């Protein structure tokens, strides 16, 4: 079976170098070129180029030239994407492909998310959020959990060990000083709080911090 796996999420800093690996299976490696496609932070897919594999020849898209590279290893069927002088604007997801030439490809790579930032590994600030009188609308009391300033991704935010997923919305996090801030809100009826325990469980194995915070009434 043809399945293209890549190096996983990579943590980088501006000014360094990286070689992004693409490991291929199900076919002879030198027989298919590797189409490299960058996904811009705005979710634009920007095509990096294809490497003639035989012959080991990279073909760059002009915008990607001279700070990027395509290198290969034939025996283990691993294609490599080399990047020099890392830049924060390069934070993105990268992809490889098994070449069907002028019709592109039938199989997409697993993807590689490069993160170029200059933070310190940090545990999140996990705050139980007490709803006020105006926060109780329509028989339900909405509760929330602020996850503030954690690096790196991901964080597992559950509620009462994940026992209640009903009204749980775990929102994405964006960059603040290269730190991530997200919030998660559980929606339970007003009869369940503060009658029943509601505790947001934030598991951040990257910083090795599992935080448990219960919301208390005011």
């Amino acid at each position: 079976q043809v399945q293209l796996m890549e190096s996983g999420p990579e943590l980088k800093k501006p000014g360094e170098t990286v070689k992004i690996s693409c490991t291929t299976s199900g076919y002879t490696f030198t027989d298919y070129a590797m189409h490299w496609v960058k996904q811009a932070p705005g979710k634009g897919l920007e095509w990096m180029g294809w490497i003639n594999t035989a012959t080991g020849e990279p073909t760059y898209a002009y915008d990607f030239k001279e700070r990027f590279g395509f290198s290969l290893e034939t025996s283990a069927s691993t294609a490599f994407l080399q990047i020099s002088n890392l830049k924060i604007e390069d934070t993105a997801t990268y992809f490889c492909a098994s070449d069907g030439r002028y019709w592109y490809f039938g199989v997409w790579g697993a993807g590689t998310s490069v993160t170029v930032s200059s933070p310190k590994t940090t545990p999140p600030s996990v705050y139980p959020l007490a709803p006020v009188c105006g926060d109780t609308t329509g028989s339900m009391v909405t509760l929330g959990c602020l996850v503030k300033g954690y690096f790196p991704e991901p964080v597992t935010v559950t509620w009462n060990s994940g026992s209640l997923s009903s009204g749980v919305h775990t929102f994405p996090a964006v960059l603040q000083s290269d730190l991530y801030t997200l919030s998660s809100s559980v929606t339970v009826p007003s009869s369940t709080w503060p009658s029943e325990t509601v505790t947001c469980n934030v598991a951040h194995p990257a910083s090795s911090t599992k935080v448990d915070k219960k919301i208390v009434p005011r």
Binding site: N52, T55, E57, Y62
Partner: protein
């Protein structure tokens, strides 16, 4: 009295901004982006490769 300008001749020249785009064998023609401007003097060629 009056003399029209027929043409001119540049006898003395100097080389500026040497640029050579290398490519692999069997790729046929090599194309440098400098062939757009007429100020750049471009020429084909080859490099024996190992």
């Amino acid at each position: 009295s009056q003399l029209a300008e027929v043409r001119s001749y540049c006898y003395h020249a100097s080389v500026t901004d040497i640029s050579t785009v290398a490519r692999c064998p069997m790729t046929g023609e090599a194309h440098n982006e400098k062939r757009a401007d007429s100020s750049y003097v471009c020429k084909q060629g080859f490099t024996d490769r190992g």
